[PDB]
Write a protein that binds this ligand. Structure first.
Ligand SMILES: O=P(O)(O)O[C@H]1O[C@H](CO)[C@@H](O)[C@H]1O
Ligand SMILES: [Zn+2]
Length: 455
């Protein structure tokens, strides 16, 4: 197996190129062996609506079975529904066969062993098990398990909408179309579906609500139908995008402001986690409500680990991953988060635009990307962490370098999916935004004067 598919948060391949049926078998063997090493013979297995799903999942299942594992086959489900399985069934282990928000040929594996979502050296450990042949051998089993109807009822019975709402739902031809418009309707909503047919070809737009062009269709539909809200889901349903009645894109860091208020009001002193890509305004808002704001690393697995470590009741990422522990299980779930958004918005007399514009805004840049190399990106960060001068600010190095100034903040960190440096800037003024960009541009040039800085 190529070593590049083994990533910080999970396993990510290109089927035919870097991922084959055989490697999915061996990944299955490795995961069963880790589960058994942690005392867990029971593993749930789910797959998204990708074309290579049926081919690779039988291989994954066979790998696990060949360890002596008792496999619970949940079939085709959103990612969070797999996580739900590994919470409500016998076992605390689970593998999701998905290629997230990526183009059709991509697939991969999100992995939970004995309650813990694997990351960093644990993903690598799986690869090393195969190379070493440190693998269990046994005669496992496979039980068919229809889990979706139970997930559905779990949400419906806990969500209490105060008024009817009309919602455009965009599933981008991903697997959220298996449940999202159905469930949202059951909550007491009228749903206008967009691209809700599961088609692994993605003939319309890539199922990636993180990009604004993938929300064009949703925004027009909201306005055209006088819908109260628009919602978008990514390929596997662990990310949510939010649009207002007037077509305003609500980024997940401002979405997390509304949730934090909500969660913290029933839970004084609750720890609330956000990633380093999120507005500094979250810190203030969380503290304002008597919450404890915990800034952490980008990446779903790192966040979930952080939640168990801190006992946080809620977490959010700038990518669209939102993790509810309160009234839930603590995994990222775009579908459950949507449900929590709708409950809160239905309890208010104002429209979604005005609910969200009540909160403070700063001049914000879009996430910036500089392509470097896989063998340079961490070294650039380390050089910046060793050598860089930022002036007066609060310097955070937990993930790249973030510096919070009184009137804004800048960030630079290495992606864990691509050979890129990821940057973000926020400020009160254009003047201050430029000052911070110039600070960061000069620190990057000082590490490598040939670095292409587009700010
Ligand atoms: O900048 P990187 O590390 O590639 O992060 C991207 O990768 C993750 C996908 O799970 C998302 O959290 C997104 O932020
Ligand atoms: Zn996803």
């Amino acid at each position: 197996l190529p070593a590049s598919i083994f990533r910080a948060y999970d396993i990510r391949g290109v089927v035919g190129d870097t991922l084959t049926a055989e490697t999915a078998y061996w990944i299955g063997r490795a995961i069963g062996s880790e589960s058994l090493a942690r005392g867990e013979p029971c593993v749930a297995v789910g797959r998204d609506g990708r074309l290579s799903g049926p081919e690779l999942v039988k291989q994954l299942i066979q790998g696990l079975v060949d360890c002596g594992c008792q496999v619970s086959d949940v079939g085709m489900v959103p990612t969070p529904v797999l996580y739900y399985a590994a919470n409500v069934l016998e076992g605390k282990s689970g593998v999701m066969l998905t290629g997230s928000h990526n183009p059709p040929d991509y697939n991969g594996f999100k992995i939970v062993v004995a309650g813990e979502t694997l990351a960093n050296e644990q993903i690598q450990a799986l690869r090393e098990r195969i190379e070493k042949n440190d693998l269990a051998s046994g005669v496992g089993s496979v039980e068919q398990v229809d889990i979706l109807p139970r997930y559905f009822k779990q949400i419906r019975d806990d969500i209490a909408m105060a008024k009817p709402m009309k919602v455009v739902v965009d599933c981008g031809n991903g697997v959220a179309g298996v449940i999202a418009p159905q469930l949202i309707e059951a909550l007491g909503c009228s749903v206008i579906p967009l691209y809700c047919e599961v088609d692994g070809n993605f003939p319309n737009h890539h199922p990636d609500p993180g990009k604004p062009e993938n929300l064009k269709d949703l925004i027009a539909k909201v306005k055209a139908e006088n819908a109260d809200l628009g919602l978008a889901f990514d390929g596997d349903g662990d990310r949510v995008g939010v649009v207002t009645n007037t077509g305003t894109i609500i980024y997940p860091d401002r979405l997390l402001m509304l949730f934090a208020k909500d969660v913290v009001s029933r839970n004084p002193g609750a720890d609330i986690i956000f990633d380093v890509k999120c507005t500094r305004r979250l810190i203030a808002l969380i503290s304002g409500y008597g919450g404890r704001p915990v800034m952490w690393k980008t990446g779903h697995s790192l966040i979930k680990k952080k939640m168990k470590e801190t006992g946080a009741l809620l977490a959010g990422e700038m990518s669209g991953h939102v993790f509810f522990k309160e009234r839930w299980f603590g995994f990222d779930d775009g579908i459950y988060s949507a449900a929590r958004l709708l409950e809160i918005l239905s309890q208010d007399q104002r429209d979604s635009e005005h609910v969200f514009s009540a909160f403070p805004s700063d001049i914000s840049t879009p996430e910036i990307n500089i392509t470097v190399t896989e063998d340079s990106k961490f070294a650039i960060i380390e050089a910046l962490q060793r050598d860089a001068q930022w002036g007066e600010g609060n310097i955070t190095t937990l993930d790249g370098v973030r510096v919070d100034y009184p009137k804004g903040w800048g960030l630079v960190r290495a992606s864990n999916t691509t050979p890129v440096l990821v940057l973000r800037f926020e400020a009160d003024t254009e003047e201050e935004l430029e000052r911070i960009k110039t600070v960061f541009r000069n620190q990057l040039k000082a590490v490598d004067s040939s670095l292409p800085v587009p700010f």
